[PDB]
Amino acid sequence: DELYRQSLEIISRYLREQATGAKDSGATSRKALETLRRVGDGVQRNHETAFQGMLRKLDIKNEDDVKSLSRVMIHVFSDGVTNWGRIVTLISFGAFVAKHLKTINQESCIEPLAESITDVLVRTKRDWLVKQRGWDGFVEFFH
Ligand SMILES: COc1ccccc1C[C@@H](Oc1ncnc2sc(-c3cccc(Cl)c3)c(-c3ccc(OCCN4CCN(C)CC4)c(Cl)c3C)c12)C(=O)O
Ligand SMILES: [Cl-]
């Protein structure tokens, strides 16, 4: 399942570098990461209040808290329209949570969070993603 692997590589590396502040299909992945670095940080900067309010309401302190997020992520992501904008918001909130997790020394929860967001995205919408040319469509879309 190469789309799952490529989606996990991009989302994992984005969340990890947002948390740590430090950088680590080859071509697409690096272009897709570069785009998140641009659109993702814009989303977080622009929606800091809603993100912080949501995170405080979710009360995320440990691996059990993070593992219980998948349902609400699937409900909210599936509830609305599929477009790259809503995909980026999902990944941006993930990054915002990864940062919180690093702050409170729960950095070991960042990987299951990235796997959880990848499962949401690839398991609700792999057809749409295939039709859009997967990560190629994302890079063309955003530049
Ligand atoms: C540009 O769109 C933004 C930007 C900032 C916040 C909300 C949205 C709507 C967007 O949200 C999402 N789009 C795609 N995937 C997801 S997944 C998700 C979510 C929802 C709950 C839990 C978890 Cl783990 C994830 C939200 C999403 C959904 C709603 C949200 O906030 C709604 C406003 N509240 C008002 C009360 N206040 C205390 C907290 C903020 C937020 Cl912050 C998010 C991240 C969301 C979309 O649905 O297109
Ligand atoms: Cl296009």
UniProtKB/Swiss-Prot annotation:
Sequence motif BH2, residues: 127-142
Chain ranges for the short sequence motif BH1 as given in the UniProt record: 75-95
Induction details: Expression increases early during phorbol ester-induced differentiation along the monocyte/macrophage pathway in myeloid leukemia cell line ML-1. Rapidly up-regulated by CSF2 in ML-1 cells. Up-regulated by heat shock-induced differentiation. Expression increases early during retinoic acid-induced differentiation.
Post-translational modification: Cleaved by CASP3 during apoptosis. Treatment with taxol or okadaic acid induces phosphorylation on additional sites.
Top-level division of the source organism's lineage: Eukaryota
UniProt-annotated location(s): Membrane; Cytoplasm; Mitochondrion; Nucleus, Nucleoplasm
Crosslink feature (Glycyl lysine isopeptide (Lys-Gly) (interchain with G-Cter in ubiquitin)) location: 23
Function summary: Involved in the regulation of apoptosis versus cell survival, and in the maintenance of viability but not of proliferation. Mediates its effects by interactions with a number of other regulators of apoptosis. Isoform 1 inhibits apoptosis. Isoform 2 promotes apoptosis.
Family: Belongs to the Bcl-2 family.
Quaternary state and interactors: Interacts with HIF3A (via C-terminus domain). Interacts with BAD, BOK, BIK and BMF. Interacts with PMAIP1. Interacts with BBC3. Isoform 1 interacts with BAX, BAK1 and TPT1. Heterodimer of isoform 1 and isoform 2. Homodimers of isoform 1 or isoform 2 are not detected. Isoform 2 does not interact with pro-apoptotic BCL2-related proteins. Interacts with RTL10/BOP. Interacts with BCL2L11; may sequester BCL2L11 to prevent its pro-apoptotic activity. Interacts with GIMAP5 and HSPA8/HSC70; the interaction between HSPA8 and MCL1 is impaired in the absence of GIMAP5.
This protein's name: Induced myeloid leukemia cell differentiation protein Mcl-1
Organism this protein belongs to: Homo sapiens (Human)
Residues of the full protein shown: 172 to 320 of 350
